[PDB]
Nucleic acid binder design. Structure first.
Ligand SMILES: [Zn+2]
Lengths: 58, 37, 209, 17, 142, 176
RNA sequence: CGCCAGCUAAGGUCCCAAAUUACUACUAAGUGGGAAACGAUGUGGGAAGGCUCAGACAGAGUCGGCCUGCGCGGAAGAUG
RNA sequence: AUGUCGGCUCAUCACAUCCUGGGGCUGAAGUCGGUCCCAAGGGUAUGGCUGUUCGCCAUUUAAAGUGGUACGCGAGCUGG
RNA sequence: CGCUGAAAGCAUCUAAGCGGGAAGCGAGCCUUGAGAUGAGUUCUCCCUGAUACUUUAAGUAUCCUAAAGGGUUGUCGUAG
């Protein structure tokens, strides 16, 4: 469920789930899918930040 | 018409043609006409 | 096609001068009056609705009575609709008479068949009876098998069985008109017409002509 | 080939004891 | 603590309008199907219809590759013996334009109560017009 | 290929109107129009039309070749036009032009009458000869085919509607 | 054994159904997603050969083998 | 404890088509045929003998198809 | 079975394009049919009162009203 939600949010911010997780890994961000998916719902801006960080790492 | 798995020139005036995905022999000799090559 | 709404009066014969008897059903077409014109703009199809006969005023609902009042026809025994295909123009109140079929050689008649109630497969579907003697046990008018073992393990839909017979819309086709009587508002139609005497019949020019 | 079987008892219901 | 759940009461469903003209049936349908579920939203909850109303116009102009126009067959069984009915894509586009896309989407949606509910939100139209001006649908390139 | 690489001259008194992929050739004998395949590139170099393949398209040369020959037939059509000549053989077989229709007696109990299409014009030099003429080589061919189809030449006495050219292989009937 | 944490295996990543994009080819047969002998100017690649501007093949190429990729026909069953 | 042959009743499907429809070839003049291709919409004997299915016979018919369905159908009949 | 037509200077029903063509296929005929929950359309008819109360609703309660029409009852039917 989380992965599906994160994928939705990432793609709204112009990155695939698969690329976003790689990005975060490369950025050394170790936020779990449970939290990410919580952020994607409750703090859309923060999700976008994380996405921008992820994009930079890729 | 001869419907056969093996179609092939029976004489020198026979000519093989593919027409709508079927191999066919067509010839001046009506007996030589074939399909289902 | 335009048609009339008759009442089946009964059968009779018409002796021709050449000594042929003609079995005729007599349909009485009391003047039909257009009660509503349906158009493509209002209703999405072209039809006339017609009434026929009279209904006791007391027997007419307010909803019914307003519909007739709008046409400025008197209430009739029911309402029947005829699709128009020819771009034919009718107005409300316009009468249709037996004289419609003055040129028509053959008509198609439609009524409700007489009701035979619950009938078995033998009468309903012309099932053969089984043996009346020679051992038959309680299974003389029985319908037989109704299927075919494990495959398919069920009775197929539309299997001919006992059930209600009759009391159904039926149309006979290509019934000749023997005589139009405009005075008495009669059509004499060769042969049989669905349903019992007194039943409503719709008469229409034959579609297969 | 079809070998004619003996599937049922020789005395048939309702008498089958 | 608990993962968020979309609430049938609260879920915001947006109207969109898609032009089918010149679009690969299947590729179009897969996108529409995901939007009807609401897979495109972070609030995507499997047990809730948080999807979006999709209007499709020019459904009769939906495209198909290969010889699929003449060879794609739609089957229906009446449940009467020998009650199988076939129609080809081309013939179904003539008879009932809209069915082609609707069938496509229907297959791609989940089976059961909710999936039937999702499909209800698809409003397919053969022409270029639709009766849902009041819903103010946004154009969507899908 | 070869056929494409050969350009089509535009004789003086032919008014070719290229509309991208469409080519309305016009001339004395009429106005023929045709949209070529997208795969075909057409160009008007001088008083010649030149045919060649679109870049990257499979069977573009083949498409280019047909388009050449199509246009060529258009040009011949509007200047000279095409004529096909049917010949009737068989006792009591006769044709006669009645209006815009070739009436044929072909030994059928019903009377046979074939309405010429728009742009086609049939004559009857004799009762036993017909001449279908027009600008569109395909229409002409179609019409002569249709008329021939009423009673195609039998193989025992040759009887029926044949092309004046057509050679009708004649078998004799099985001995006895 | 518990956990609304993370990584992977086989298998996967259009939608049902969690997850992919880019690029290079080939296939047009829904091949993929049943079936052989054999048949066939289907089409892609490779390495040679014969014949030809002293004119080939039917005024420039053309013919036939070989090694190979992918396709075609051959291909009829019973409730849907 | 899944009743087993044949009949009767009632069927339903396949198509490898018996008839009827459309075709090609014919050693197809015509009238008929043969053979192959398309086609499963509808139609597709009654009797004599035998428990028979079958078969033979008589006389029909446009034709008297070939199969699958617990060699369809005994909580539907029969029981030779 | 073609017409026109290249690939393949020819040829070629086919690759682009345009035809003919079956008792079969979709309509056409008859019947059912909006539980077609996607529950359609049209025509006509009927109901235009008070109050309090609350955690204010498509609220509750009381009073007054009881329409169009539907039923039950009755005489019956070629309907059962
Ligand atoms: Zn030959």
């Amino acid at each position: 469920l989380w992965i599906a939600r994160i994928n939705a949010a990432s793609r709204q911010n112009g990155l695939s789930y698969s690329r976003f997780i790689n990005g975060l890994k490369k950025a050394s961000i170790e936020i779990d899918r449970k939290i990410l998916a919580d952020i994607a719902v409750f703090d859309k801006a923060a999700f976008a930040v994380l996405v921008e960080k992820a994009k930079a790492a890729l | 018409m001869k419907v056969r798995a093996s179609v092939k020139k029976i004489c020198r005036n026979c000519k093989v043609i593919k027409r709508n995905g079927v191999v066919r022999v067509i010839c001046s000799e009506p007996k030589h006409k074939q399909r289902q090559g | 096609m335009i048609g009339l709404i008759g009442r089946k009066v009964g059968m009779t014969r018409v002796f021709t001068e050449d000594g042929v008897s003609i079995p005729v059903t007599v349909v009485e077409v009391e003047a039909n009056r257009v009660s509503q014109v349906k158009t493509l703009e209002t209703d999405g199809y072209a039809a006339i609705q017609v009434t026929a006969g009279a209904k006791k005023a007391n027997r007419v609902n307010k909803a019914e009575a307003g519909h007739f009042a709008k046409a400025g026809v008197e209430a009739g025994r029911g309402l029947w609709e005829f699709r128009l295909e020819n771009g034919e123009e009718f107005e409300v109140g316009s009468e249709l008479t037996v004289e419609l079929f003055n040129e028509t050689k053959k008509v198609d008649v439609t009524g409700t068949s007489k009701g035979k109630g619950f009938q078995g497969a033998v009468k309903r579907w012309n099932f053969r009876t089984q043996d009346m003697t020679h051992g038959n046990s309680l299974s003389h008018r029985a319908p037989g098998s109704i299927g075919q073992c494990q495959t398919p393990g069920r009775v197929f839909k539309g299997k001919k069985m006992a059930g209600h017979m009759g009391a159904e819309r039926v149309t006979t086709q290509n019934l000749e008109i023997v005589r139009v009587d405009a005075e008495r508002n009669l059509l004499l139609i060769k042969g049989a017409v669905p349903g019992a005497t007194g039943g409503n019949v719709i008469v229409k020019p034959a579609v297969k002509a | 080939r079809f070998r004619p079987p003996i599937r049922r008892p020789p005395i048939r219901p309702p008498f089958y004891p | 603590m608990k993962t968020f759940v979309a609430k049938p009461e609260t879920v915001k469903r947006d109207w969109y309008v898609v032009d089918a003209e010149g679009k690969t049936l299947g590729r179009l349908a897969s996108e529409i199907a995901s939007r009807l579920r609401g897979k495109h939203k972070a609030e995507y909850t499997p047990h809730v219809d948080a999807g979006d109303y999709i209007i499709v116009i020019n459904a009769e102009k939906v495209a198909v590759t290969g010889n699929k126009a003449k060879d794609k067959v739609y089957y229906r069984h009446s449940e009467f013996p020998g009650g199988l009915k076939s129609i080809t894509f081309e013939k179904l586009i003539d008879r009932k334009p809209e069915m082609v896309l609707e069938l496509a989407v229907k297959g791609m949606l989940p089976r059961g109560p909710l999936g039937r509910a999702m499909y209800r939100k698809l409003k397919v139209y053969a022409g270029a017009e639709h009766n849902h001006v009041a819903q103010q649908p946004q154009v969507l390139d899908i | 290929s070869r056929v494409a690489k050969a350009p089509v001259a535009i004789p003086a008194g032919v008014e070719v109107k290229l509309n991208g992929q469409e080519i309305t050739v016009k001339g004395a004998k009429g106005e023929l129009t045709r949209v070529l395949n997208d795969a075909v590139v057409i160009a008007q170099e001088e008083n010649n039309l030149t045919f060649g393949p679109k870049e990257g398209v499979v069977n573009a040369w083949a498409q280019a070749g047909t388009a050449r020959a199509l246009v060529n037939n258009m040009v011949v059509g509007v200047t000279e036009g095409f004529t096909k000549k049917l010949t009737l053989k068989g006792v009591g077989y006769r044709a006669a032009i009645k209006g815009n229709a070739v009436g044929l007696t072909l030994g059928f109990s019903h009377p046979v009458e074939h309405e010429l299409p728009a742009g086609i014009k049939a004559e009857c030099p004799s009762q036993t000869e017909i001449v279908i003429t027009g600008a569109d080589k395909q229409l002409v061919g179609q019409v002569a085919a249709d008329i021939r189809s009423y009673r195609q030449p039998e193989p025992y006495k040759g009887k029926g509607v044949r092309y004046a050219d057509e050679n009708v292989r004649t078998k004799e009937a099985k001995k006895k």
